[PDB]
Amino acid sequence: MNPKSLTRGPRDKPTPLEELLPHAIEFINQYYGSFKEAKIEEHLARLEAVTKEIETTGTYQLTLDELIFATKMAWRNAPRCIGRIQWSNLQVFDARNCSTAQEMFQHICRHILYATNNGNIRSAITVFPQRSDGKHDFRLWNSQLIRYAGYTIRGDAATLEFTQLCIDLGWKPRYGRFDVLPLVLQADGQDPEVFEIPPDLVLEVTMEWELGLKWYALPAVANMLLEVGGLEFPACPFNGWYMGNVAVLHSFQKQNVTIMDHHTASESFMKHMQNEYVLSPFYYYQIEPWKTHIWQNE
Amino acid sequence: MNPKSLTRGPRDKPTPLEELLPHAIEFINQYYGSFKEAKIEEHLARLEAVTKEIETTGTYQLTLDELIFATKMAWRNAPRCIGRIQWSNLQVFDARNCSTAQEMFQHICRHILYATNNGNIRSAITVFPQRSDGKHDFRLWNSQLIRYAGYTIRGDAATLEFTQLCIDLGWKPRYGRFDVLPLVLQADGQDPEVFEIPPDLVLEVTMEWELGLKWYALPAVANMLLEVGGLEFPACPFNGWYMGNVAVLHSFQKQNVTIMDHHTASESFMKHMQNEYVLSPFYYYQIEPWKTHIWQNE
Numbered sequence: 001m002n003p004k005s006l007t008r009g010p011r012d013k014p015t016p017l018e019e020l021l022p023h024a025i026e027f028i029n030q031y032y033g034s035f036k037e038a039k040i041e042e043h044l045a046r047l048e049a050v051t052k053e054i055e056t057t058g059t060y061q062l063t064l065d066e067l068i069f070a071t072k073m074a075w076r077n078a079p080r081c082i083g084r085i086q087w088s089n090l091q092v093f094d095a096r097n098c099s100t101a102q103e104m105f106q107h108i109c110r111h112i113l114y115a116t117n118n119g120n121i122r123s124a125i126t127v128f129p130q131r132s133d134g135k136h137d138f139r140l141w142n143s144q145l146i147r148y149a150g151y152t153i154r155g156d157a158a159t160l161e162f163t164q165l166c167i168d169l170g171w172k173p174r175y176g177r178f179d180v181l182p183l184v185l186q187a188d189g190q191d192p193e194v195f196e197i198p199p200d201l202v203l204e205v206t207m208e209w210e211l212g213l214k215w216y217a218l219p220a221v222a223n224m225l226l227e228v229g230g231l232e233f234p235a236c237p238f239n240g241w242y243m244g245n246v247a248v249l250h251s252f253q254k255q256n257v258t259i260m261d262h263h264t265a266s267e268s269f270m271k272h273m274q275n276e277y278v279l280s281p282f283y284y285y286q287i288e289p290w291k292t293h294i295w296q297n298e
Numbered sequence: 299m300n301p302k303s304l305t306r307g308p309r310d311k312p313t314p315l316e317e318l319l320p321h322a323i324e325f326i327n328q329y330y331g332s333f334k335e336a337k338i339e340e341h342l343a344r345l346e347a348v349t350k351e352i353e354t355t356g357t358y359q360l361t362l363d364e365l366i367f368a369t370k371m372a373w374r375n376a377p378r379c380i381g382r383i384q385w386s387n388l389q390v391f392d393a394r395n396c397s398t399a400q401e402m403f404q405h406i407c408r409h410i411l412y413a414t415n416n417g418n419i420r421s422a423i424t425v426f427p428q429r430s431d432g433k434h435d436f437r438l439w440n441s442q443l444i445r446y447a448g449y450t451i452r453g454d455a456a457t458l459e460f461t462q463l464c465i466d467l468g469w470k471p472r473y474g475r476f477d478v479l480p481l482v483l484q485a486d487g488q489d490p491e492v493f494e495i496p497p498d499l500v501l502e503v504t505m506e507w508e509l510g511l512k513w514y515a516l517p518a519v520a521n522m523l524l525e526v527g528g529l530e531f532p533a534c535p536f537n538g539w540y541m542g543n544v545a546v547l548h549s550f551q552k553q554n555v556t557i558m559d560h561h562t563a564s565e566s567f568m569k570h571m572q573n574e575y576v577l578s579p580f581y582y583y584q585i586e587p588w589k590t591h592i593w594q595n596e
């Protein structure tokens with residue numbers, strides 16, 4: 001067997017141009033190939049401009065449309081994702097001009113608001129600045145945007161470690177069982193900063209003859225890396241909606257929070273279908289950033 | 299003399315509870331003893347929960363922090379390991395929820411990536427699921443994660459046998475002198491599967507007035523067993539870095555691959571020291587798994 005690694009690690013230097021250029025060219029082809037017989041000239045013109053940009057600057061920037069295409073193809077290329085059948089249903093927020101953690105936070109608020117949509121969940125991805133030399137990475141340290149803390153256990157037992165990290169970073173732990181962990185955000189390679197998510201941004205389905213059980217509506221992956229044309233985006237949170245004695249199906253449907261039931265299955269595929277008139281791009285796992293981060297202040 | 303065996307063999311049944319419980323209790327004590335006067339109540343509470351878990355399930359699970367502690371104490375307890383002086387410098391990857399060989403492979407890729415760190419080597423251990431009844435063991439059949447094949451001789455003369463085994467398993471032997479052997483991975487007691495290591499994951503120091511000599515940067519023991527509190531982890535690869543007419547010291551230092559020179563000696567001990575504000579646990583040798591494995595398909 002010759003499987004590839006599903007993980008893409010840190011760098012300490014820019015991608016060598018001799019490595020980057022072939023990848024850039026291949027993606028450009030894939031992109032312009034999505035127009036079949038049309039646009040031969042734009043294709044070649046783009047090849048020339050990208051090549052020059054790389055030779056001049058050591059890298060290149062994607063057009064907005066190229067980025068949108070990339071995020072959708074990466075989704076289409078996600079082997080385990082059930083949602084990828086309707087891969088055209090994806091809203092893209094372009095945050096590649098982001099520079100600070102405060103700005104990252106505002107972008108994520110915007111994302112959570114749009115995708116939550118008061119229960120009528122919409123898929124979205126927010127793309128932060130691409131890796132340059134690898135010493136200025138933007139990363140979200142959370143595994144998901146919204147997750148309950150973990151503290152025997154109290155809360156989300158799978159975040160006991162991350163919860164402890166937040167505390168160590170100055171987060172004040174309320175010790176409930178449904179404490180929404182803060183966003184831990186790294187901009188430009190700096191030490192991460194801690195941001196409470198505004199409670200009003202977090203939609204929860206309350207389960208329904210008293211246990212006080214509830215769960216958050218928005219499942220959002222915070223910690224993967226988008227690869228495209230040799231470029232790496234170490235910060236690119238995205239979300240879908242849930243797949244699904246189970247008062248869940250009932251509580252979600254009764255509170256009208258989207259889940260992947262047959263109706264939603266048919267509808268989303270219907271909408272996807274109406275949007276018509278080594279794998280790359282790809283979402284990679286990363287090494288947990290607290291295991292690799294060099295603190296400029298601990 | 300009353301030396302103990304440094305080898306821990308296979309089982310065909312779960313550890314008897316009457317054997318397991320005393321060992322579990324002893325480790326819990328060792329763990330909570332590392333807090334001196336504090337935490338008497340957590341200690342007793344943990345004793346009670348572990349005892350109940352064993353009586354209920356026939357075994358028990360370590361907390362993440364208990365596991366981390368165990369791996370570091372086992373290292374501290376390794377008589378021949380020079381690196382154990384700086385035993386607090388160890389990154390632990392928890393793969394105890396692993397179930398398939400493909401998953402094992404992804405964990406090992408992640409390990410190789412982190413520990414290699416583009417030449418700035420970091421110590422790490424990846425811990426796979428603990429032995430249950432002994433008929434579902436996870437094992438790596440390699441002695442190291444990265445090793446050259448052996449084929450008079452061609453390649454690593456010490457792997458002639460293992461190389462032959464890989465071939466017998468379906469591996470196609472390129473007949474060079476520096477062929478990186480594939481990972482041979484056994485999950486849940488199943489027959490092993492063969493996985494080429496992605497070449498880009500393998501860092502090599504090229505020796506430097508033409509012989510074409512090179513060697514791999516990452517020394518990683520693949521085949522030992524971690525014992526702790528009566529639990530056995532037959533799959534727990536770990537790595538350090540090398541100790542060191544010798545163009546080696548030069549080639550490694552000049553290509554900035556870590557070795558245990560005086561500088562690295564002082565630095566790593568310095569970092570270890572800043573991490574402050576029958577032996578058990580222990581790493582055992584095992585019997586070569588191809589000598590004991592019952593093929594459900596040959």
Ligand code: HEM
Binds near residue numbers: 080081082241242283
């Ligand atoms: C529209 C609703 C969506 C549904 C129902 C859905 C469902 C799933 C499910 C069930 C998994 C597997 C979880 C596991 O194995 O533990 C998954 C994985 C994943 N999803 Fe989604 N997803 C959706 C939207 C998205 C979006 C918008 C993206 C990206 C733009 C995406 C990217 C991925 C990726 C990369 C993985 C990992 C896939 C792999 O490793 O093979 N998903 N998704």
Ligand code: HEM
Binds near residue numbers: 540
């Ligand atoms: C940080 C760099 C490290 C260095 C320089 C180092 C060096 C060594 C050396 C020189 C040996 C003896 C080899 C021989 O006799 O053929 C050894 C053995 C060993 N090392 Fe390391 N090591 C390091 C990290 C580790 C780590 C991370 C672990 C485990 C978490 C570890 C566990 C062991 C074990 C169990 C043995 C066998 C010891 C025995 O049988 O007495 N080493 N190491």
Ligand SMILES: c1cn(-c2ccc(O[C@H]3CCCN(Cc4ccc5c(c4)OCO5)C3)cc2)cn1
Binds near residue numbers: 083
């Ligand atoms: C879109 C969103 N996702 C995920 C979101 C959140 C994820 O977190 C995992 C760990 C916490 C519990 N999560 C439960 C879950 C299960 C199935 C599912 C989820 C979340 O979102 C889409 O479909 C799984 C995993 C995957 C995948 N695509």
Ligand SMILES: c1cn(-c2ccc(O[C@H]3CCCN(Cc4ccc5c(c4)OCO5)C3)cc2)cn1
Binds near residue numbers: 540
């Ligand atoms: C960490 C890593 N190790 C080892 C890694 C690899 C090992 O393989 C042996 C057989 C192949 C050649 N190896 C050479 C060697 C020598 C000294 C050393 C090595 C490898 O890694 C740490 O220090 C020894 C043995 C021990 C021990 N601690």
